[PDB]
Amino acid sequence: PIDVSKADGIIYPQGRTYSNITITYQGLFPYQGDHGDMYVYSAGHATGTTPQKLFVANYSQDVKQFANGFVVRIGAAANSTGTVIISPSTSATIRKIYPAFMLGSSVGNFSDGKMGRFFNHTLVLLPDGCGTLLRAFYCILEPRSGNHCPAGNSYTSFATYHTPATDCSDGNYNRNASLNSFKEYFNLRNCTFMYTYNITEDEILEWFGITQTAQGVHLFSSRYVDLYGGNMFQFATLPVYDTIKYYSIIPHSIRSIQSDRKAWAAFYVYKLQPLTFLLDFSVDGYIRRAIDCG
Amino acid sequence: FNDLSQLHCSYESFDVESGVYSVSSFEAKPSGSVVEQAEGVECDFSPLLSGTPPQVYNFKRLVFTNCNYNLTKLLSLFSVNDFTCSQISPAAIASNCY
Amino acid sequence: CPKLEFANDTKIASQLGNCVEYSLYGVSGRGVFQNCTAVGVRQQRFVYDAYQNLVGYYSDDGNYYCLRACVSVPVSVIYDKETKTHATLFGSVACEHISSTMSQYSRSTRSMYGPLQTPVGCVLGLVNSSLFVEDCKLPLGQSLCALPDTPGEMRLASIAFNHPIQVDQLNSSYFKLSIPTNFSFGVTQEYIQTTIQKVTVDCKQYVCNGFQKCEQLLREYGQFCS
Amino acid sequence: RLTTLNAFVAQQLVRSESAALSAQLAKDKVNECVKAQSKRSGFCGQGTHIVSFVVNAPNGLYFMHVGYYPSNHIEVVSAYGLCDAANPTNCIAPVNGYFIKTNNEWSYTGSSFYAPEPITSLNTKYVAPQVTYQNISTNLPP
Amino acid sequence: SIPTNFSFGVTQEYIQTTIQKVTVDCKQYVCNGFQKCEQLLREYGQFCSKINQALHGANLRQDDSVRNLFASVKSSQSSPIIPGFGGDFNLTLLEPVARSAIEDLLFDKVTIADPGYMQGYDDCMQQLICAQYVAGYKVLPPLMDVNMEAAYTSSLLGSIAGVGWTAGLSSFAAIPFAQSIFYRLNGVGITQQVLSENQKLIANKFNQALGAMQTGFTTTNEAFQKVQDAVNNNAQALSKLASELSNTFGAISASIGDIIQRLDPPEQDAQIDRLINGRLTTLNAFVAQQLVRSESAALSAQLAKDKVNECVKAQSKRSGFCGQGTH
């Protein structure tokens, strides 16, 4: 659960910082002590050195309202030893992962009737190059009619696969093969844009937040400013054309070999609603102490 | 005319009482003006002027942040039939910054 | 912002410590810049107090400049009846300001130094003197007083302390006593406002003045008169 | 007009409460230092209050207090009381005055006027001996 | 029932004898030096004159109260203050060495900001009290300098040992402090035998009682809390005028210049009228609060004059009028 007194997941004032004062601010914020929507990613099946069929959860059929945006804590379990999801008896080092986001305004069923189809233009956030690149696009997606494909036969769910035998080598990054893995299931039509963002790979916990205004979709993070701290800070202003009503998480699997199955971190989701917080802006202006009203 | 004139009209009488009286203070004149912050490329209005304008229920939106805009470059070519401005003056958009 | 010819006299370092009308790309006002230490975050570039007043600005050169205020000087006047004598005061300021940078309507003095340094500030129209007055009727502040002439400008005096008649303390069995030898009867006049004048108001007569449509528009309020 | 009348009503209530408090103060003053001589230091008359007179005023009550005012103070030598050298137990102390050393010896004076006069029994009281008193062996007071 | 043992207890009291003298420049505060603002303000007219007259009347009332109480506490005759005053009775906390040690300790332990009476303009120029100039008002200097207030207290400390020996203010009898304490202890119903035999223990008890409250200046003292509450009351009263300038009262901006720069004259007239109405209502409320506080200050000053005339220059026999137990 998020502790507001521990200064976790608070949206900074957008353009007017302060210093060494206690001030009441009305805005979009989460409740104190929310269990949230914790999700975990796992590696696929493998026997020896053969990357076998995937191993993902059911989150493709899960959809929630976007409402007033939400915050996500990334890598809160890393730099630690934890169990492997596919192999419960195996314990490995927990490594941070970055999630994939799917946002839209229409909800419908697939060819087999399962929930998850989003009509018209859809916003997709997807990390690539072992998470170094942060590709984003609000574009048209089209299903495929092949085997295990959304408009085809033997369809269960859709997911994105990662194979760190060649993706996570020195340099390389297998030329954006997570975008390849997503396009292995979907097709891109009348695409509006392609925003790329760079984040250096590390083992430090971080934060992220997403919201929408009439200007567009605002993406806030701590990687740009507060590396050793953690607070929202404006880095992305996506020029969206329509209001986002619903959101969902893309499943992701890892095609790691069985003898080198490495543990992946689990992330969290906390929704935002309007409140009036009390904030303590320190001498550097960073948020370190915050208390609620409700 | 002077201090004592304001003092006399503060009482609506030509006879006042002896006493220390607070009166309207004076302001120091400005020594100049400074206008300096980060600037970049001019704001781009080309796709507004190019292509078919869409319908009223499908209006196309352009956002402008961190740029330079001059109304004499695009409003001069605009054959403006009607110009209204609500909760803002019409001349504020030509000079004021946002 | 609109395009503007940026002259060389627009940087902060050119006009440090001077009251300037700043237009920080939409943030308008008048104020004084000063050099301080880096406080806040660099990305936001704007800091405010608890009362939504701008405090400082991160200039493009990498220097932080505090923007505080274009502070003004208050003015007070000492005027005497039945002796047409007046003088002006600038409160809690050193004698530095002269008649150059003016605002409001105007000001006037008499024929001719002119300033004077006081704990209350800078005084125009008074001559200072080593005078002590126990019954000052024009108390300027702190302990300064103006003495009109009974006819030049008023003499500046200090409000003295009536030292009581000192008696010595003997550290022996005897004592030094003080006793009056002469006396008078003094009348002290006191007033007590024991009651104010009893007054009442007719509500409908005062507010309505006997008009029928007025009365109909008054009857909805009702018990307010009661 | 109704807002103005409500403001006037509030001001009238405040002034009436102030008038009631001042009337209570006036009753206290006329009960203490008008029908009697109050010993409170400057409660209603500066200096030692002697007498008071009360008249009416077109809104209130007007007081005039005749009070004592000293002038031309002098510095003298005084003691705490006289005791016998042969009988240190017996000691006297001044009553509503002081013991003042004045020649043509010890003398008594009033508390508000320099009036030297020979010491008698009608203006002193007996008191327990202390170390600080002034013994005498050549002119014993009666 | 009779007591067998005793102590000297210090009871600390505070009296708010006068509030801080403050005035406001009406056109500067409400208008901030704008011409169209001034033209829209001139229709109201005498409202600025009304609030100036009310504030000046309150200030003159407080000044008259201060002068009256200082004439009341002006001792007719006093005694010099020397080191070693009171002999064995250690009272050097009250010794002036300027102010005294206890007064400097009280002023140090209370959060007090000097209102820039020498270089406050320079204080706003080069390096919360800077807001009392920019917001369009001022705080008047007090009627006395600090230096003189002090004398007055030095004269009172020299006269308390002498006046409280015989009734009547005409004479002066400035006995050393120890025998004044002995006479007062005789007067409050203690026999002269125990005073004559037990000077050392009562001297030690008095010294310990005086020294106990020196380190007691904290939140636990009620008079210290009342002093802090009065200072915070003055701070809040000034912080009103420094604060709700930013209040808009329904306007779309809190700056007159931005309003006249951004709005059409039909609508900037309405916006400025709303701003003027809100600021004038706030100023009238502040004037009413100042009048109420000035009346309370006058009543408290009369009470302080009564207390210093009854149980300071003399030993009052009233049961707990100014000291719990036998004063």
Ligand SMILES: *[C@@H]1O[C@H](CO[C@@H]2O[C@@H](C)[C@@H](O)[C@@H](O)[C@@H]2O)[C@@H](O[C@@H]2O[C@H](CO)[C@@H](O)[C@H](O)[C@H]2NC(C)=O)[C@H](O)[C@H]1NC(C)=O
């Ligand atoms: C104005 O106030 C006093 C006026 O006292 C004058 O003293 C003589 C110098 C002479 O000019 C007479 O006309 C006046 O009686 C002055 O303050 C004096 O400042 C000087 C310098 O610090 C000091 O040596 C004197 O002692 C001061 N005078 C007294 C009485 O203390 C001075 O002329 C003016 N005050 C200031 C602050 O400049």
Ligand SMILES: *[C@@H]1O[C@H](CO)[C@@H](O[C@@H]2O[C@H](CO)[C@@H](O)[C@H](O)[C@H]2NC(C)=O)[C@H](O)[C@H]1NC(C)=O
């Ligand atoms: C930030 O504000 C705090 C809170 O007032 C300041 O810290 C106080 O400083 C005073 C000065 O002696 C101390 O008496 C208090 O005990 C301090 N309080 C705390 C909580 O530290 C601090 O000085 C301010 N800093 C800046 C840079 O303005």
Ligand SMILES: *[C@@H]1O[C@H](CO)[C@@H](O[C@@H]2O[C@H](CO)[C@@H](O)[C@H](O)[C@H]2NC(C)=O)[C@H](O)[C@H]1NC(C)=O
């Ligand atoms: C007065 O005469 C007496 C007796 O000769 C002396 O004073 C006594 O001194 C002792 C010593 O401390 C005290 O205990 C007594 O109380 C004193 N008695 C009185 C009556 O004072 C001394 O000669 C004289 N005392 C003076 C001048 O104070």
Ligand SMILES: *[C@@H]1O[C@H](CO)[C@@H](O[C@@H]2O[C@H](CO)[C@@H](O)[C@H](O)[C@H]2NC(C)=O)[C@H](O)[C@H]1NC(C)=O
């Ligand atoms: C009276 O009491 C005061 C306060 O206790 C004494 O002042 C202290 O003196 C000591 C010794 O010089 C210092 O260390 C302390 O710092 C002083 N305290 C203060 C608050 O000033 C004083 O010495 C005492 N005097 C007598 C004669 O006993």
Ligand SMILES: *[C@@H]1O[C@H](CO)[C@@H](O)[C@H](O)[C@H]1NC(C)=O
């Ligand atoms: C997906 O799994 C979660 C985990 O408990 C469950 O709450 C949810 O109902 C599941 N949804 C579907 C469609 O099976």
Ligand SMILES: *[C@@H]1O[C@H](CO)[C@@H](O)[C@H](O)[C@H]1NC(C)=O
């Ligand atoms: C994509 O754009 C083409 C070009 O006009 C258009 O014909 C087609 O209908 C568009 N498809 C979608 C799904 O928007």
Ligand SMILES: *[C@@H]1O[C@H](CO)[C@@H](O)[C@H](O)[C@H]1NC(C)=O
């Ligand atoms: C990210 O870093 C790579 C490495 O040089 C560079 O080629 C690419 O342009 C960078 N992208 C962004 C958006 O900074």
Ligand SMILES: *[C@@H]1O[C@H](CO)[C@@H](O)[C@H](O)[C@H]1NC(C)=O
């Ligand atoms: C201003 O302050 C900064 C940092 O406090 C310092 O580096 C710089 O030299 C200063 N400049 C002047 C002119 O004092």
Ligand SMILES: *[C@@H]1O[C@H](CO)[C@@H](O)[C@H](O)[C@H]1NC(C)=O
């Ligand atoms: C005060 O005491 C000192 C020392 O005991 C002594 O020298 C001095 O004479 C005394 N003064 C008087 C007036 O008795």
Ligand SMILES: *[C@@H]1O[C@H](CO)[C@@H](O)[C@H](O)[C@H]1NC(C)=O
């Ligand atoms: C008392 O003083 C008055 C004036 O102060 C004087 O006329 C009168 O002679 C004095 N009387 C005595 C006895 O000194």
Ligand SMILES: *[C@@H]1O[C@H](CO)[C@@H](O)[C@H](O)[C@H]1NC(C)=O
């Ligand atoms: C007598 O007493 C008076 C009053 O103190 C004094 O002036 C005078 O000198 C004394 N005479 C003698 C001889 O001591």
Ligand SMILES: *[C@@H]1O[C@H](CO)[C@@H](O)[C@H](O)[C@H]1NC(C)=O
């Ligand atoms: C009086 O009380 C105090 C503490 O209450 C004690 O220290 C002292 O000894 C007592 N004295 C007597 C005479 O009982």
